[PDB]
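Translate sequence into structure tokens.
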Amino acid sequence: RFLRRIFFFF
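Result follows.
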């Protein structure tokens, strides 16, 4: 949904 996720993912 948000890039803030794929960024904090790993």
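Note: The longest helix spans residues 3-8.
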